[PDB]
Amino acid sequence: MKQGIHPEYHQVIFLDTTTNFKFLSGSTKTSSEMMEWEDGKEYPVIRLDISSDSHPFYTGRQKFAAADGRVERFNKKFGL
Template sequence: MKQGIHPEYHQVVFQDSTTGYKFLSGSTKGSAETITWEDGNEYPLIRVEISSDSHPFYTGRQKFQQADGTVARFNKKYGLDQ
């Protein structure tokens, strides 16, 4: 690999702005805002709008809008279902 072309990789804390959930992970992104983590060290804080704590796919709180197909809904609405 070429030297000096890769960004610096360091530990940061990501915080879900919806739920307040925080997790420590590696990233190349930095931040001027810092937070003291559970281990007593300070890390850059990056706020995210969605994480595994608030995303419906991971939480199981998905809402299924339509269970039947378009044709079945049309037939049901207009009484053509026989």
């Protein structure tokens, strides 16, 4: 790489806060908070709302049951 043209870039820990799932990768975010890695050296941590281990599509988790059919809604509404 050439010198002085590329932005500052360094290893960070992306931390999915929902599942408290850490994984190390490079990025230019430069977040202040530091959390120790399995390796001794700490690196800045990036808080993550969602991730591959927390997304319903990735995990297959079904948040809500499928919509009832018309016959089923008729029956459950009218008690028959």
